[PDB]
Design an enzyme around this catalytic site. Structure first.
Site, PDB file in Angstrom:
ATOM      1  N   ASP A 104       3.966 -16.335 -34.461  1.00 21.91           N
ATOM      2  CA  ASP A 104       2.700 -16.093 -33.764  1.00 21.91           C
ATOM      3  C   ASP A 104       2.840 -16.656 -32.350  1.00 21.91           C
ATOM      4  O   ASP A 104       3.824 -16.333 -31.672  1.00 21.91           O
ATOM      5  CB  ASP A 104       1.555 -16.616 -34.672  1.00 21.91           C
ATOM      6  CG  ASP A 104       0.156 -16.299 -34.189  1.00 21.91           C
ATOM      7  OD1 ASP A 104      -0.443 -17.088 -33.408  1.00 21.91           O
ATOM      8  OD2 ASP A 104      -0.359 -15.195 -34.609  1.00 21.91           O
ATOM      9  N   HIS A 271      -0.122 -12.231 -42.645  1.00 22.76           N
ATOM     10  CA  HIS A 271       0.362 -12.628 -41.350  1.00 22.76           C
ATOM     11  C   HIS A 271       0.963 -14.035 -41.322  1.00 22.76           C
ATOM     12  O   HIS A 271       1.826 -14.356 -40.488  1.00 22.76           O
ATOM     13  CB  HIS A 271      -0.809 -12.610 -40.365  1.00 22.76           C
ATOM     14  CG  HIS A 271      -0.435 -12.947 -38.975  1.00 22.76           C
ATOM     15  ND1 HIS A 271       0.165 -12.039 -38.140  1.00 22.76           N
ATOM     16  CD2 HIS A 271      -0.684 -14.054 -38.230  1.00 22.76           C
ATOM     17  CE1 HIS A 271       0.327 -12.589 -36.962  1.00 22.76           C
ATOM     18  NE2 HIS A 271      -0.163 -13.823 -36.995  1.00 22.76           N
TER      19      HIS A 271
END
Lengths: 297, 297
Positions: A104, A271
């Site tokens: 991320d 995610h």
């Protein structure tokens, strides 16, 4: 099982920041960089295994967790600035060249570090990320709905700070649950660390600044590299969430436009790959690092 | 100068709503529909002049201002539902066919009313609006940044309600200043009315519901009309903010895909045309309504 057994917690004083770092192990160096809205603890299921074979450095990104800019007024939160933090961090610890594994926002710091300082990055692993320039080109109705916060948090100071700061724990908890697709992946003690950081107005501001930089200077930097034909010089691995990708948006295809040596795999998880799918992530990481053992020299 | 001199304030009880209405004048009927985050008072610089020559009806949209759904739990805030409110409102007042002038969300109610109930709409004026289907097709990075709230307010219940409800007056004031481009256009007493409405959690919820409908059912309704080849049957005028429009996005060009009889003009003001540019708006409106006087019969 304890969190980060045998990790030594340090505070590094660099030219522009005070950085929280945790280190363990011996051998070739690896720098692991968390994302939003988390801290270095997001690596707790991965870093111990890696430290059996590598020198492992975990850092809180500037402004996140316990890391802070020294300029409390007008600090630079661009990925380029945070990349320089990493150079200084690893240099202080004894490393002029090292592998970088990012998730991320941390992967955004990582690829910027690789582009700007190719002599320093032996290998690069991105979990869930492609370059921001590619993300912006993909914006459509569904993207903007799914990633609404990319647009909210990038609004001028102090709009998003006022909104997300009203009830920080509500917003943090909502966001983590959403990113995990409701899956029970957060160690209750790691969660308290994420919560404490998010309760700090300076952390929330730094997060907004990250998102503002993404719109602006970070995208400009990516465009300049695209214009110059500058690519990452090291082997790259991309690990992505198993989901459909529109034409031109598949992460392996995108990375091959940014680097000559690219491999990767889909992982069937949310995610939040570090916490949701650590065993899968580890299998891929270990294999990649072993395959490029000569590059790490 | 007083606000809405000689307007008679009514509360209408319709099948699904309790609606605040203000009326004045005689002659052919006009229904004026405000937008976000406002109330019927947004017409205070326009409606008095119109009421010299027309029967003028100003309404608060369902959930906005003083208008409320009777279903306090699961009410329908789609444009189709609010269009039916308008039919019932005008019908109760004695009008089965009338002209509609809308700004912002009110123009969205208006065009939906025209498509669904062509026998009821003699003429239609849109200030600043094209159909949502066209807006969604235009989403890109800059759109999503400029109109970030379209994505925030459409997030599932109760995310945006929690954020915008923390400090309602801050968010209202910020939003109005932004929409006005900092221009001093809000009558201090109209402003207190907008503020009071926004302090009501039910109003804020209804606004979020409007934005959710925009993403979902409203867009589906527009697509169905496009698929069917259904167009507005009345004369249309579009008055738009003077700014650049990308290819395919000019409001006159878009309206000509939705209606066979279209005219319009640019106005050099902020988005808040009713309050910022009333004299310009009036010149255009009066001319349009006079040119189509036979249609109003």
């Amino acid at each position: 099982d304890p969190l980060l057994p045998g990790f030594d917690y340090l505070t590094l004083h660099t030219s522009a920041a005070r950085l929280r770092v945790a280190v363990k192990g011996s051998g070739p160096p690896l720098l692991l960089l968390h994302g939003y809205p988390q801290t270095h603890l997001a690596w707790h299921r991965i870093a111990p295994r890696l430290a059996e074979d590598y020198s492992v450095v975990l850092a809180d990104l500037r402004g996140y967790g316990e890391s802070r800019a020294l300029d409390e007024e007008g600090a630079d939160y661009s990925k380029a600035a945070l990349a320089r933090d990493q150079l200084e961090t690893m240099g202080q610890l004894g490393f002029e060249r090292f592998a970088v594994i990012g998730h991320d926002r941390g992967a955004r710091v990582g690829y910027r570090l690789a582009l700007d300082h190719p002599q320093a990055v032996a290998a690069f692993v991105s979990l869930t990320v492609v370059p921001i320039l590619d993300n912006w080109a993909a914006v459509n109705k569904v993207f903007a709905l799914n990633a609404y916060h990319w647009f909210l948090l990038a609004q001028p100071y102090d709009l998003p700070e006022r909104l997300i700061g009203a009830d920080p724990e509500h917003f943090l908890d909502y966001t983590l649950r959403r990113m995990a697709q409701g899956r029970d992946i957060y160690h209750p003690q790691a969660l308290e660390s994420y919560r404490r950081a998010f309760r700090d107005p300076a952390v929330r501001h730094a997060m907004c600044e990250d998102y503002r930089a993404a719109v602006g200077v970070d995208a400009d930097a990516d465009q300049a590299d695209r214009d110059a034909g500058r690519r990452l010089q090291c082997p790259v691995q991309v690990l992505w969430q198993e989901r459909p990708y529109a034409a031109g948006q598949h992460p392996l295809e995108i990375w091959k436009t940014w680097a000559g040596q690219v491999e990767g795999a889909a992982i069937g998880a949310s995610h939040m790959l570090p916490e949701d799918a650590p065993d899968a992530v580890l299998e891929h990481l270990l294999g990649f690092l072993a395959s490029h053992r000569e590059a790490l020299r």
